[PDB]
């Protein structure tokens, strides 16, 4: 009943540096605002990340498979630079997957986010800032370092990848993620 290596998750050949502080298990979700699989997975991974608390260091990395969606990576880091990510992100997803507003340009984003209480001037500055440009370029470099081919992909301690591509279900992805983190904590992975 336990997840099968090479089937339910992938043991990476070139594991990556881990920024978690020893006690914690690192968890990275490669996601994309426009992926409906990452959209439906948002409440499941959220609640779980909060359930682990001090036991993990969770972070997200936006994925842009084509230049069309680089603004979605700039959007991710522009909101974080403002500290409004956790507040507006539910509205971002819903705008894309229910309101037929895909937020593909900085102007459309500044327009939408202003209805959510975000000052247009301050958002566009972060969007065009060199710091957000650098975070976007780094996220694309992480895509290659982690050999990410699809989303949502979850990486545990920079060694093990899982996701619906492996498990064929979001619930199965959550179960695998939970299994891997525990195996890490027990020095079995």
């Amino acid at each position: 009943s336990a997840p099968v290596a090479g089937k339910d998750f992938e043991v990476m050949k070139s594991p990556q540096p881990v920024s978690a502080p020893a006690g914690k298990v690192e968890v990275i979700e490669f996601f994309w605002y426009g992926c409906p699989h990452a959209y439906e997975f948002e409440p499941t991974i959220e609640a779980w990340v909060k359930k682990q608390g001090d036991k993990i260091a969770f972070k997200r990395v936006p994925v842009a498979f084509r230049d069309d969606f680089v603004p979605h990576s700039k959007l991710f880091y522009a909101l974080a630079a403002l500290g409004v990510s956790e507040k507006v992100t539910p509205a971002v997803f819903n705008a894309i997957h229910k309101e037929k507003n895909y937020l593909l340009t900085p102007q459309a984003q500044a327009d939408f986010l202003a209805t959510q209480g975000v000052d247009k001037k301050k958002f566009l500055d972060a969007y065009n800032s060199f710091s957000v440009q650098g975070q976007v370029k780094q996220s694309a470099e992480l895509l290659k370092n982690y050999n990410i081919d699809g989303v949502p992909t979850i990486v545990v301690q920079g060694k093990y990848k899982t996701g619906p591509a492996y498990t064929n279900s979001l619930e199965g992805t959550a179960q695998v993620l939970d299994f891997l983190v525990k195996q890490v904590q027990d020095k079995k992975l």
Partner: peptide, 6 residues
């Protein structure tokens, strides 16, 4: 499985 990948 399934995922957004391209």
């Amino acid at each position: 499985g399934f995922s957004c990948g391209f």
